[PDB]
Amino acid sequence: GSSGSSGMPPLTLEGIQDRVLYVLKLYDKIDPEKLSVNSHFMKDLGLDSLDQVEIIMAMEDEFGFEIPDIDAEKLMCPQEIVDYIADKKDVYESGPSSG
């Protein structure tokens, strides 16, 4: 309870990264202190692929994309994703998007 206020500023890279971390944070398995824009998952964290599919899928949802295992596998850091997002630069582009 106890409501206050919480707006949602424009959409900028600052949001992608934060999200990349935020999402990674949501994962108790992944510690925030250790977590870092430049922090591996298997070299540092030491997670398993089973976690990679998740972490990735997390970004695919948090951003709403379709990252193939061929990519998710190439992604071993949070910054690596940001790049994938930044590129997308908003998903307000035409296309057959159904609910």
Curated annotation (Swiss-Prot):
GO cellular component term, pick one: mitochondrion
Domain Carrier, first and last residues per copy: 14-89
Where does the UniProt annotation locate this protein?
Mitochondrion
Query: Major place of localization?
Result: mitochondrion
Q: Which UniProt keywords apply?
A: Acetylation, Electron transport, Fatty acid biosynthesis, Fatty acid metabolism, Lipid biosynthesis, Lipid metabolism, Mitochondrion, Phosphopantetheine, Phosphoprotein, Respiratory chain, Transit peptide, Transport
Q: Which domain of life is it from?
A: Eukaryota
List modified residues, type O-(pantetheine 4'-phosphoryl)serine: S49
Record PTM:
Phosphopantetheinylation at Ser-49 is essential for interactions with LYR motif-containing proteins.
- One of this protein's GO BP terms? iron-sulfur cluster assembly
Which GO-annotated molecular functions does the record name?
A: acyl binding; acyl carrier activity; calcium ion binding; fatty acid binding; mitochondrial large ribosomal subunit binding; structural molecule activity
Q: Which residues carry this modification: N6-acetyllysine?
A: K25
Oligomer status and interactors: Mammalian complex I is composed of 45 different subunits. Interacts with ETFRF1. Identified in a complex composed of MALSU1, MIEF1 upstream open reading frame protein and NDUFAB1; within the trimeric complex, MIEF1 upstream open reading frame protein functions as a bridging scaffold that interacts with MALSU1 on one side, and with NDUFAB1 on the other side. The complex interacts with the mitochondrial large ribosomal subunit. Interacts with alpha-1-microglobulin chain; this interaction is required for the maintenance of mitochondrial redox homeostasis.
Briefly state the protein's biological role.
Answer: Carrier of the growing fatty acid chain in fatty acid biosynthesis. Accessory and non-catalytic subunit of the mitochondrial membrane respiratory chain NADH dehydrogenase (Complex I), which functions in the transfer of electrons from NADH to the respiratory chain. Accessory protein, of the core iron-sulfur cluster (ISC) assembly complex, that regulates, in association with LYRM4, the stability and the cysteine desulfurase activity of NFS1 and participates in the [2Fe-2S] clusters assembly on the scaffolding protein ISCU.
In the record, the note on similarity to other proteins reads: Belongs to the acyl carrier protein (ACP) family.
Recite the other comments.
In contrast to other accessory subunits of complex I, NDUFAB1 is the only subunit that is essential for cell viability in HEK293T cells. Since knockout cells lack assembled complex I and die in galactose media, this suggests that the essential role of NDUFAB1 is independent of complex I.
Q: What is this protein called?
A: Acyl carrier protein, mitochondrial
Q: Which organism is it from?
A: Homo sapiens (Human)
**What stretch of the complete protein does the chain hold?**
71 to 156 of 156
